[PDB]
Amino acid sequence: RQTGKTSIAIDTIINQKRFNDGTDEKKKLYCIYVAIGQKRSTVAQLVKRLTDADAMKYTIVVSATASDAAPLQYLAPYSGCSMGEYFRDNGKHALIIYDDLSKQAVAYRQMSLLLRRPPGREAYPGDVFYLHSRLLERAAKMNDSFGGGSLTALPVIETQAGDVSAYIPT
Amino acid sequence: RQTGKTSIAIDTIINQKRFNDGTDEKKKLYCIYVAIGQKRSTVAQLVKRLTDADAMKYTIVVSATASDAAPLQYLAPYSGCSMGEYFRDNGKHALIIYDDLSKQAVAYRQMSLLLRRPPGREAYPGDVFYLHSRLLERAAKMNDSFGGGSLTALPVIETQAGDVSAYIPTNVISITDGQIFLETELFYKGIRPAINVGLSVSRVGSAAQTRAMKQVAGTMKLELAQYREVAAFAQFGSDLDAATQQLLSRGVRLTELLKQGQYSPMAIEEQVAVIYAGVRGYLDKLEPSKITKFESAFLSHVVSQHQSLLGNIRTDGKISEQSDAKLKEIVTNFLAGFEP
Amino acid sequence: RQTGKTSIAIDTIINQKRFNDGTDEKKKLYCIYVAIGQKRSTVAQLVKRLTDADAMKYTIVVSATASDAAPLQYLAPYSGCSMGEYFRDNGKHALIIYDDLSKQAVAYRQMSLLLRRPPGREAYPGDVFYLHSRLLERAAKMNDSFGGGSLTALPVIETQAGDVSAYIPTNVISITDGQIFLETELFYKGIRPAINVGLSVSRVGSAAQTRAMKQVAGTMKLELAQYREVAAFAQFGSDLDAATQQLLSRGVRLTELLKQGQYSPMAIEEQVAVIYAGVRGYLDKLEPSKITKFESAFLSHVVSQHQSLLGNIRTDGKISEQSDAKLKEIVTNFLAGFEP
Amino acid sequence: RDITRRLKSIKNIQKITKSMKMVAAAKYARAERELKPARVYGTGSLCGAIHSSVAKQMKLANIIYYSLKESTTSEQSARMTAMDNASKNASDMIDKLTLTFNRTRQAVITKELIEIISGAAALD
Amino acid sequence: SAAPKAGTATGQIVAVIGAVVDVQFDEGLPPILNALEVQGRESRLVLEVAQHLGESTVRTIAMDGTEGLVRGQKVLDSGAPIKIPVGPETLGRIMNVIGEPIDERGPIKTKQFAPIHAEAPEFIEMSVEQEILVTGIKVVDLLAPYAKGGKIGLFGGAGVGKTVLIMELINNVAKAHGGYSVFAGVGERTREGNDLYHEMIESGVINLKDATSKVALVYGQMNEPPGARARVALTGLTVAEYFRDQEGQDVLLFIDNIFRFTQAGSEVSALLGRIPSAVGYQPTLATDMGTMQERITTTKKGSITSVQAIYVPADDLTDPAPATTFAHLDATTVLSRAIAELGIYPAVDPLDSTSRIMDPNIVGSEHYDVARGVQKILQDYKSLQDIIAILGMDELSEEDKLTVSRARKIQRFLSQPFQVAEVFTGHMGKLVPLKETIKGFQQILAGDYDHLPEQAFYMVGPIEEAVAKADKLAEEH
Amino acid sequence: GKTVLIMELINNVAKAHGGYSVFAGVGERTREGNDLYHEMIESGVINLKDATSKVALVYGQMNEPPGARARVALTGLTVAEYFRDQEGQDVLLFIDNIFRFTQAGSEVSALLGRIPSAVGYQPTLATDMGTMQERITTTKKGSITSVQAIYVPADDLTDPAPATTFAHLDATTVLSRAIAELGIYPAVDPLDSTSRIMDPNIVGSEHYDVARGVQKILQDYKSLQDIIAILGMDELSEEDKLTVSRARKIQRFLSQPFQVAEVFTGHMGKLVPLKETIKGFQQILAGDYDHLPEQAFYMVGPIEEAVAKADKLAEEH
Numbered sequence A: 001r002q003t004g005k006t007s008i009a010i011d012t013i014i015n016q017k018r019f020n021d022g023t024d025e026k027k028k029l030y031c032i033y034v035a036i037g038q039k040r041s042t043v044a045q046l047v048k049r050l051t052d053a054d055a056m057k058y059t060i061v062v063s064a065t066a067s068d069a070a071p072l073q074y075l076a077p078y079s080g081c082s083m084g085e086y087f088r089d090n091g092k093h094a095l096i097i098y099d100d101l102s103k104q105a106v107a108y109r110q111m112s113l114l115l116r117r118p119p120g121r122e123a124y125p126g127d128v129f130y131l132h133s134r135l136l137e138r139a140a141k142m143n144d145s146f147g148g149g150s151l152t153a154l155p156v157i158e159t160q161a162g163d164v165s166a167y168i169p170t
Numbered sequence B, C: 001r002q003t004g005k006t007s008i009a010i011d012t013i014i015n016q017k018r019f020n021d022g023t024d025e026k027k028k029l030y031c032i033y034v035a036i037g038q039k040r041s042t043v044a045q046l047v048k049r050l051t052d053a054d055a056m057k058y059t060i061v062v063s064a065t066a067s068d069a070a071p072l073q074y075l076a077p078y079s080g081c082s083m084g085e086y087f088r089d090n091g092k093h094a095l096i097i098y099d100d101l102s103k104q105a106v107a108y109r110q111m112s113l114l115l116r117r118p119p120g121r122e123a124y125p126g127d128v129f130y131l132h133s134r135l136l137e138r139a140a141k142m143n144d145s146f147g148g149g150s151l152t153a154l155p156v157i158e159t160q161a162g163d164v165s166a167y168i169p170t171n172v173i174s175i176t177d178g179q180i181f182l183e184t185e186l187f188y189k190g191i192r193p194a195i196n197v198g199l200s201v202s203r204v205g206s207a208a209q210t211r212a213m214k215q216v217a218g219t220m221k222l223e224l225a226q227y228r229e230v231a232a233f234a235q236f237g238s239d240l241d242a243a244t245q246q247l248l249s250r251g252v253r254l255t256e257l258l259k260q261g262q263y264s265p266m267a268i269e270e271q272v273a274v275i276y277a278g279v280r281g282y283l284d285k286l287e288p289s290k291i292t293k294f295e296s297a298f299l300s301h302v303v304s305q306h307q308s309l310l311g312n313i314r315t316d317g318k319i320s321e322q323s324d325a326k327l328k329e330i331v332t333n334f335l336a337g338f339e340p
Numbered sequence D: 001r002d003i004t005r006r007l008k009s010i011k012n013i014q015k016i017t018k019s020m021k022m023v024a025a026a027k028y029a030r031a032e033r034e035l036k037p038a039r040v041y042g043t044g045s046l047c048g049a050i051h052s053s054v055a056k057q058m059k060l061a062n063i064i065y066y067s068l069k070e071s072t073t074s075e076q077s078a079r080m081t082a083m084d085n086a087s088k089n090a091s092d093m094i095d096k097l098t099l100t101f102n103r104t105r106q107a108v109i110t111k112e113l114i115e116i117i118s119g120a121a122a123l124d
Numbered sequence E: 001s002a003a004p005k006a007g008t009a010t011g012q013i014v015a016v017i018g019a020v021v022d023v024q025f026d027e028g029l030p031p032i033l034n035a036l037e038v039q040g041r042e043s044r045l046v047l048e049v050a051q052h053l054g055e056s057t058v059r060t061i062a063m064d065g066t067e068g069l070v071r072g073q074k075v076l077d078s079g080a081p082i083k084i085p086v087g088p089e090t091l092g093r094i095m096n097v098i099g100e101p102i103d104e105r106g107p108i109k110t111k112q113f114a115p116i117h118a119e120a121p122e123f124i125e126m127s128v129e130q131e132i133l134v135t136g137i138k139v140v141d142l143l144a145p146y147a148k149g150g151k152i153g154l155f156g157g158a159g160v161g162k163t164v165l166i167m168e169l170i171n172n173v174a175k176a177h178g179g180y181s182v183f184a185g186v187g188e189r190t191r192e193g194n195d196l197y198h199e200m201i202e203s204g205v206i207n208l209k210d211a212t213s214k215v216a217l218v219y220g221q222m223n224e225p226p227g228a229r230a231r232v233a234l235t236g237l238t239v240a241e242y243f244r245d246q247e248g249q250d251v252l253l254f255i256d257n258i259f260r261f262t263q264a265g266s267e268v269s270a271l272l273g274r275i276p277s278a279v280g281y282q283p284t285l286a287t288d289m290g291t292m293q294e295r296i297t298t299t300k301k302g303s304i305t306s307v308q309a310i311y312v313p314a315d316d317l318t319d320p321a322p323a324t325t326f327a328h329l330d331a332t333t334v335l336s337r338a339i340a341e342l343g344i345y346p347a348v349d350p351l352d353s354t355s356r357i358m359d360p361n362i363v364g365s366e367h368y369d370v371a372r373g374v375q376k377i378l379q380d381y382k383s384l385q386d387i388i389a390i391l392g393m394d395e396l397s398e399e400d401k402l403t404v405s406r407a408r409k410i411q412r413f414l415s416q417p418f419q420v421a422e423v424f425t426g427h428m429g430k431l432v433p434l435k436e437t438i439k440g441f442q443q444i445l446a447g448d449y450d451h452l453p454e455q456a457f458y459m460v461g462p463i464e465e466a467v468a469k470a471d472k473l474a475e476e477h
Numbered sequence F: 001g002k003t004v005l006i007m008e009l010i011n012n013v014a015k016a017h018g019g020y021s022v023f024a025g026v027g028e029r030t031r032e033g034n035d036l037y038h039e040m041i042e043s044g045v046i047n048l049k050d051a052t053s054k055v056a057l058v059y060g061q062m063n064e065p066p067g068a069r070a071r072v073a074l075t076g077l078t079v080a081e082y083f084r085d086q087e088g089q090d091v092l093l094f095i096d097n098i099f100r101f102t103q104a105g106s107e108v109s110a111l112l113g114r115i116p117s118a119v120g121y122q123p124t125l126a127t128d129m130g131t132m133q134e135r136i137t138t139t140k141k142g143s144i145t146s147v148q149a150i151y152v153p154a155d156d157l158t159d160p161a162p163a164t165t166f167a168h169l170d171a172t173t174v175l176s177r178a179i180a181e182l183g184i185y186p187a188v189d190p191l192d193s194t195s196r197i198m199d200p201n202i203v204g205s206e207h208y209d210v211a212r213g214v215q216k217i218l219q220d221y222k223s224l225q226d227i228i229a230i231l232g233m234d235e236l237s238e239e240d241k242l243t244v245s246r247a248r249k250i251q252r253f254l255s256q257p258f259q260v261a262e263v264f265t266g267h268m269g270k271l272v273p274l275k276e277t278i279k280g281f282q283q284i285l286a287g288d289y290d291h292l293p294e295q296a297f298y299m300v301g302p303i304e305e306a307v308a309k310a311d312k313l314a315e316e317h
């Protein structure tokens, strides 16, 4: 908590500034900032902040903020993945920030338990892997014969006191 | 286990002796000793024991002893609560001892599981809170406009090796105001009752401690709070604050007096006699050990040649400027009472 | 894992060689090696290996190897138990090795869960006790009035990092009499078999150890018991009991002899040759290391010029006053056998 | 499993320190027998931290031996505290970590146990 | 009286599943707790009723192998709990979990048999009178004392004490004691159960000839299902009772593990249609260790100087098994495995071995003071041994270095090897009812006598031996 | 370790070896699966033109459901088999994680109408890691020099996943995360890396002795590093201070960086089939050669380099 996971992702996205109007079109980058869990005002701190550096001008931001029933907080990553895939399938490229897959972790087990799908480890529905594998596995490098495009994806994760090897982080 | 939770509650109840036939009817107390779990012979050790001091004469005792199916061990606290409520609704007051809510904890989860009510944490039926909240929340102070009565309730809890934060204890310490911790870990050392200052509090604040303790005890507990450091540090001190020795010296000496332990309560004006002498650094310097001789003899010494002093407490209701001088003139004599 | 649990059981079974064609029919032994879990090639490493020493000629081996559905891995121990029971009910005797009851532990919970029998601790079906009790309880000593037969059973168990008190191990060590602990933690140090005295015992008492060991080994194990302290203390000793060095010296030297390890068993009268020499502090003082040279050569030395001594064991059945003198006259020579 | 490692270190520190604890007094024995006649009127008329206070104050068999003879003990005293003071405080850690082991020993046992039934008990 | 209604008290087994056999009666539903009789059998198969499931069907907890049982087998309704032959005509003999003679010497000719399920002594049956009873065993006797009608309980995992100390107490007790003796071995080994028999023959206690037998042997162990290990401790208890009540005598009672009454639940609860709990256990462990243990107590008709033993699963006192039991033992002794390493035997630990009869009025002011002082010094000792000095003693502070001589020697003085450990090194089975405990031990703490070469006083308690050992192992020149 | 060491072994093995080769990637990354393809092209192994391909690529990974990660390792196994049996050859087989055959159960058990178990798992993990692993074995028709990899959930060896598997591996190598910190690579630990082919008859009396002696010194080393001296070495007892030079250097000699780690610092991919392992390492434990400025012998194994490094980083005047 409060370590810098979003400043970094907010600077990594902010950097694409110069290129989104520069010369080398291939030396560009479109961003898809996803938010999972977050209070809708933390998200408005970013939309506006980014807007201050004009960053928002070359970015798409999406929210699955607390109010949103667990499913929204679940479908969201898989939504932004399809945002960049336009670019990863059209020459263009993208930087997608999945803000809190762990918060989606907290928000996934819900939908299933209620569906009465036998819980496994710390509630997580058995396919906790297929949940964060199936996704990331979409941000792939593209060959010229297929496009030359791309999609880089940095999934944000909540470290509890320092343990990086917890179920979900593993 | 075996730390003193019942001796304390058996002395706290025993103390009401003098008042249950004395003058000031408002300065009385009826007790409702509840037992949850206990072997029915441990309970007969108490009924009879109390009976020996005639305590049983002004007390109600109730049992939910092992034989009793889990529900009895469950309904019992909620039974004694309604015993005192007669008093907490009729001017009169009561001291209720809920003996082992934790044992009721062990005995609650049963009734529900068998009812097939989805278990939660360590079996405890979800409403483990509403179990020990709903109850305690009944021992409340009563305003004159409503009665002026009362019901004080000390729920007894089983400490597993020292952990006070276990589910149920959290549950119960997240409600009650004031938790006296009894540590087996200390006990035998002579450190009895063995109360862990820092992991315990009166909570209600100075309100309880009459002008007497607010005059003396005001320093006592918090003196020991941070002292947990220097007491666990002096054992390896050297080129430091030379004179610091004082703050540590106020601990060892005081200790032999702060360790209450016997089948007899010391009236508040007596507490004012011995302990007070300590806070007002007079005994101090003397090599300890024989201190207990004081806290025992001083009393005989009092009733033998100092029956006035205590009365000043029954007149003014605090330690007098005059009486301080006198008690001073009595404890000072004890410095050289064993000093050649 | 990889500590020696099977080499030991493979040497304990291999030893019965000489007797399964010798004279004294009562001084024999049939073995029933059971395998639970193991890859069927690890089992073929043993069948063949044993076959190399002809051991397989006087043994029955059975397998519940991985392929086999959990039930096979479950019924197997209870199968070999009935193998030896022929012998434990017919004068004859048997040595049964239950290879991995813990692996049957992993393989038991399956069959039940699938039967939908409410799981308990770490899946294990409630009757995890009745699983490894009910069994072992069959390898019993037989009285002459009932047969004089027997069935000795050493259940093999998987130690997870060193914890011997895990559910299943508790379950199994709360029954069996005598538990030889094998520690991976030691092994490579040369400390093999690596048995943790203190967290292991023979339990049945001196009864097993013949007059031979009761004459020598009587000191050995308990010598090491408390020694766990001084062995883990001498590493930082200084101004203490000067001569104390003796009790520690009896450890290091002895160690190089107590570390058995090879595809060959040393007959009891040979055990009487080398180890005995140690308890009777004769080798001691000499700088160790070369001790192993002794425990290897001493034997060749024996059969080369000391075939009588061992026979005294086959005559009297203990170490002789005479033979002690002789062995003494042989080990003493070894002090200066490498000493100029 | 986990605390075992944390408990290993301590136990590893014991052997060396706890044993030398006895030596702490031993060094004394091997000194006084000869030192005494030379003291008082016989002439005139970790590793603690004792071997330090003297050295920081810089801001022929006579004195050089008499001083050293008395200083020998002064220096060796490091072991005394190192095997006493450093063990008395450290040993508490054993009982703590141990009781804590039995805390997350029980815990895991009563943690995973939940999961096993979390699915088992509710079906049809 | 055991007789049903004018309608079938016969039920046809509808479902067998391990240690549980559901039965279904059409004209005579048999009550919870009733001992039942399996017909079609080739032996004795009593299934104790347990629940009343409805659809005119009970649910019994099987007392022995359920092997070969068949869906349809007639189950006989007796009309009363499993009732064992209680009386003198069962002393010296050995009984299994139903009253069947297991020592093989034939029928137990008895005037009657008591039910194994009886209403415990009420509150006005109890008796405060706590008269002392010496065992002559350092910690176990001096430290955490015992008492008449008291309750012993030892706490160690697998092999550290318990059975051994139960034989030990048997020595220092069982042999010489007025009245009778009982030994209900629950769960534990059949080996010990046999030897114990034979040892009880070799020493007279059990005499197969005359009629000079003071003990009774009720057994129900390991090679059996849980429904038998559950009630065996009950029978060995239904036994001590009748000797006290109807035959007003001060019995004793040895239960080789009484919590085996709980493993039985850990094996039959959930399979009875229950929702698990602590570690899995049962929504009953409490009332269980309760209802039963609330039987082996004194009364205004007789006393039962009982003795029990409680296992420590996973070496975890934190298990609601040794724990929940604590509140029943009138003496504690949690033997440490971490102690076994140190050799200290019995492994009775210096903190977790309480009592309800340790006041200066019965045990002693001097003795209880030194006990307090023993543990006092022992506490800061437990800390110092590690904290501050860090393992290695010496260091500084002779105040605690004193502890390194006192407390250390103390641990030794209390490490009484005794007779029962004769099979490991034939060592001096030290004991003696107090006698010269005065002076000796008192000396240590004060400093008197204490100083002899540490471990020079390890495998012996009585201080006299310090100098009497100094010769064995000396040091000087 | 795992994937890296599987590529490492691929180097030291896969490239040169008679017979064929197989690689069933289970669960793991699609990236590695692609590169591996291309690397297998750049180096010939996989030739798209002629017909000079010795390996076979059976894949079933992450972007897929569990029912596929479950059987993929099976196919890459149904593959090694036919090469050994019906085509009597000594195949090999690389399974990038074989316990992915288990995560599949952790994802399909309970949803099949099963009652959970260890951590949740399945009333089958046993027979599973069993029934399958009891396939990649030799026979009187051919051999399968298989190679697998097993994950360590929550960094817990205490998980019945890496554990239950142990009883199948004819060689162990539990790489420590606590080791990674120390740099020691591969992270093969000095205790939990057993074998069923380490007897003086095949590996060597001298070698197995020094191995035992390496771990021996290493054990009391694990204790001393903390116990007694308390972190800070020096202290006293040069006997163990010897360990601080021996065991320490030993850890280094065994920390072979090798080719596969070329992407982090392009370091000397040390290897060599035994050859000059004699003398060199033997020296250390006995005391011969051992003494050079500790870390001066860190990122290199062959003793020859100690003096051959002493020049790189010297010390004296």
Ligand SMILES: Nc1ncnc2c1ncn2[C@@H]1O[C@H](COP(=O)(O)OP(=O)(O)OP(=O)(O)O)[C@@H](O)[C@H]1O
Binding pocket: A001, A002, A003, A004, A005, A006, A007, A008
């Ligand atoms: N570059 C920086 N250097 C120092 N502090 C920073 C930097 N960037 C941000 N911070 C501040 O430190 C904290 C870290 O950013 P942020 O709050 O988003 O962290 P986080 O790990 O994403 O957690 P959370 O958003 O839930 O609070 C904030 O208060 C942030 O403004």
Ligand SMILES: Nc1ncnc2c1ncn2[C@@H]1O[C@H](COP(=O)(O)OP(=O)(O)OP(=O)(O)O)[C@@H](O)[C@H]1O
Binding pocket: B001, B002, B003, B004, B005, B006, B007, B008, B192, B260, B261, B262, B263, E327, E355, E356, E357, E358, E359
């Ligand atoms: N004032 C005292 N000073 C010293 N020891 C005492 C004192 N009062 C009681 N003891 C004794 O110490 C133990 C503590 O009392 P008690 O036995 O009721 O403790 P507890 O914590 O309530 O636990 P439990 O009743 O389950 O044993 C008893 O043996 C008791 O008689």
Ligand SMILES: Nc1ncnc2c1ncn2[C@@H]1O[C@H](COP(=O)(O)OP(=O)(O)OP(=O)(O)O)[C@@H](O)[C@H]1O
Binding pocket: C001, C002, C003, C004, C005, C006, C007, C008, C192, C260, C261, C262, C263, F167, F195, F196, F197, F198, F199
């Ligand atoms: N007497 C011995 N001295 C030294 N090493 C030995 C000895 N006997 C066997 N070893 C070797 O040490 C290891 C221990 O035997 P084994 O492999 O059967 O151990 P285990 O504890 O049964 O475990 P597992 O069989 O699962 O590997 C083997 O590699 C074995 O060949």
Ligand SMILES: Nc1ncnc2c1ncn2[C@@H]1O[C@H](COP(=O)(O)OP(=O)(O)O)[C@@H](O)[C@H]1O
Binding pocket: C200, C201, C202, C203, E157, E158, E159, E160, E161, E162, E163, E164, E165, E345, E346, E417, E418, E420, E421
């Ligand atoms: N009196 C004793 N003295 C020393 N060690 C003992 C004694 N009794 C038991 N032990 C140790 O404990 C081991 C087994 O414990 P034991 O007490 O016999 O178990 P339990 O009594 O629970 O059946 C022994 O084999 C031995 O090491």
Ligand SMILES: Nc1ncnc2c1ncn2[C@@H]1O[C@H](COP(=O)(O)OP(=O)(O)O)[C@@H](O)[C@H]1O
Binding pocket: F001, F002, F003, F004, F005, F185, F186, F257, F258, F260, F261
């Ligand atoms: N040969 C090596 N030498 C040093 N570090 C390595 C080596 N192989 C892997 N690592 C470290 O491990 C990290 C990833 O582990 P890796 O072995 O590649 O995982 P896995 O093989 O399980 O997929 C690397 O990015 C690097 O720090």
Ligand SMILES: [Mg+2]
Binding pocket: A005, A006, A007
């Ligand atoms: Mg953030």
Ligand SMILES: [Mg+2]
Binding pocket: B005, B006, B007
């Ligand atoms: Mg109490």
Ligand SMILES: [Mg+2]
Binding pocket: C005, C006, C007
């Ligand atoms: Mg093996």
